[model samples]
Target: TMRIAYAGLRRKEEFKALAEKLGFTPLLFPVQATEKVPVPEYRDQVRELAQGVDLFLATTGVGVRDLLEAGKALGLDLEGPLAKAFRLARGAKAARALKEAGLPPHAVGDGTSKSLLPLLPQGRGVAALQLYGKPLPLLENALAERGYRVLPLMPYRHLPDPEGILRLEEAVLRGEVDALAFVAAIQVEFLFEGAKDPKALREALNTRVKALAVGRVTADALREWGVKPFYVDETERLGSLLQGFKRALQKE
Candidate 1:
């Protein structure tokens, strides 16, 4: 029987059902997530920046949702101000969220910040970033070096469950898992940190077990961990990842 290690936090029940339908056992080892404490200082910063933003960069679907939520919480007219800017979404999911929130993006990138950030015009102008969890140095540094005045917003944070991660590491070492599925970049980071010997786990991933990344963003994370995935879903969706995993299994 196939056993899949699930590292995402949301939609646990949905993953369990999908795994069962595919005749696979799912091992739930969810990483933790916590809402970022709102800083009033940053709230005002985002408000002023939005009014004159030349480029609005949305990094994730949840980040887009959180941006709208934060706006309401701060009693600002975020949507109207955002509409005036040239919006760019990091992927399809962010683009969908932007449309649903009445601030449709001017363009949607191919699920990578590198692809999205380069769309900006080559000149110094105010830029606002909507991001989930902690700030990314790569994004921040790139925008600054590219001559854009950057205002990076963090609406939430990711926390790893040490106990759960240790359990996942044990499973890998014991070869109890056939494949590991990662849905987000943060999940990959936590999974590696959770292991007692991350290098050993990385070796196991590369040599013995199969690995799946839900999308290019996640695939990049796996690469950072020194374990390239056996498969990366063409579509950045869980259903697509599962279907791709099934095909990969069959081919093996």
Candidate 2:
């Protein structure tokens, strides 16, 4: 049976279902994990957000919870400021977080940061974000260009899993898998960094294992890591990438 692998932090079941439909065994190799940062790491950022911004946004539900928990530890009333500020939520998950806290979202959009761009109000002001993990470069850049001072409050972080990265690299080098789907840019970063020999790993990906990137950001990351991506998807969905994988192989 053909085997494929995925290198990312979340939504493995969705990927697995799609892979199985094509009769390929799916292997999940998560390169990052949710790791809560120390209060000091995000304390000051939270303090500033608690002092209030013109707008408040929450990207993920757990992140919102973490922000609330962190603020309580600092003896700050986070809900008070959030209630006053115009709030935005990335999805129902994030929206519920705000609602339960007595701060309903002014807008609720999907997972992708780009979808939330239309929700921001017109003009210059301060906007505080309850970050999901790593920074949302697209959203942040758009906000900055539109004249908003981005106040970042990182509730939790997704840090590289050392052993996990090594395992995926070794699997690819050993040729146990056919194609590896990368769902995020950080997965490519961690995978390449943990490889025993990045050059050899790159070559293996070029010749032996096909490389699949979920979107432009991840495809760019693969190039940045010195491995040309074999397939790229615009949907940012693993199933779409899996379909791309099938089409690429058919063409080959």
Candidate 3:
């Protein structure tokens, strides 16, 4: 049986079903993701900041959803304010969310902050950064340095399941897992952060375990952590990821 470690927080059963179809034994271990509760004061701050915003940076689909969800509760009209600004989305997922909310993105990025930064318009003004999980310090610093008032709108946070992380560490170290699938970028960060010794975890993932990413962002996260993925799905979906995994092993 081919032992595979699944690290997606959502759609675990779908992946497991596909694994069975492919004749692979998947060790289903999912990370955790929770939406952050926005403080009332912070919501007020965002409401105030939205008026003078110059550009809107939409980083994730979940971020867009959470932002709308939060705004609806706060009696804040985000659509009008966002429509007045030049909207930028990190990828198709974010763009789709924006479209659903009647706020089509003016430009779409290549799934990384670095890719999105250059596209920002010049001159000093507020940039409304909608992010999921923790804000990327580098992106924030870069925007601030460029003379834009960085207004961060963190709508949700992603965290890993401690037990699942431990199981992944043990599996890698014991050479019991053949491939590991990561669905989200944050899952990569949590997996490493949850390890007792990160260097050993990095080494194990880099050299021995075959790593898989659902899309470019997840692949970029893996690369940022110094672990090159064995396979990355072109289409960002559980079905595509499962098919990619099957194709990767078929060649080996």
| CA-lDDT, candidates in order | 0.78, 0.80, 0.78
Clashing residue pairs in candidate 3, if any? none
TM-score of each: 0.60, 0.57, 0.63
Model 2 TM-score, all chains together:
0.57
What digit string (tens of lDDT, one per residue) describes model 3 on residues 138-251?
A: 677777887788787764455557887888788888898888998878888778767777788778877788888877788877776678799998786777877777787789
Off by over 4 Å in 3: 1-42, 69-73, 99-103, 159-178, 191-207, 214-228, 232-247
Supply the global lDDT for candidate 1: 0.78
> The CA-based lDDT of model 2 is what?
0.80
Off-target runs (Cα >4 Å) in candidate 1 are: 1-42, 159-179, 189-209, 213-248
Instruction: Give the better candidate number (1 or 3) by TM-score.
Output: 3
Candidate 2 runs further than 4 Å off: 8-39, 159-252
* Candidate 2 local lDDT, 227-247, one digit each (tens): 788999999667788887889
* Per-residue C-alpha lDDT of model 1 across residues 1-252, encoded as one tens digit per residue: 888989887788989998888788998877655434555466776677557777788878887887788788878888777888888887888999999998888988776556655676655787788766655556667778778887877644556677888888899899899889888787877777567898999999997888888867788668767897999986756777888888887897
Q: Which ten residues in a row have the lowest lDDT in candidate 1?
A: 31-40
Candidate 3, residue 164: Cα displacement in angstroms equals 9.5
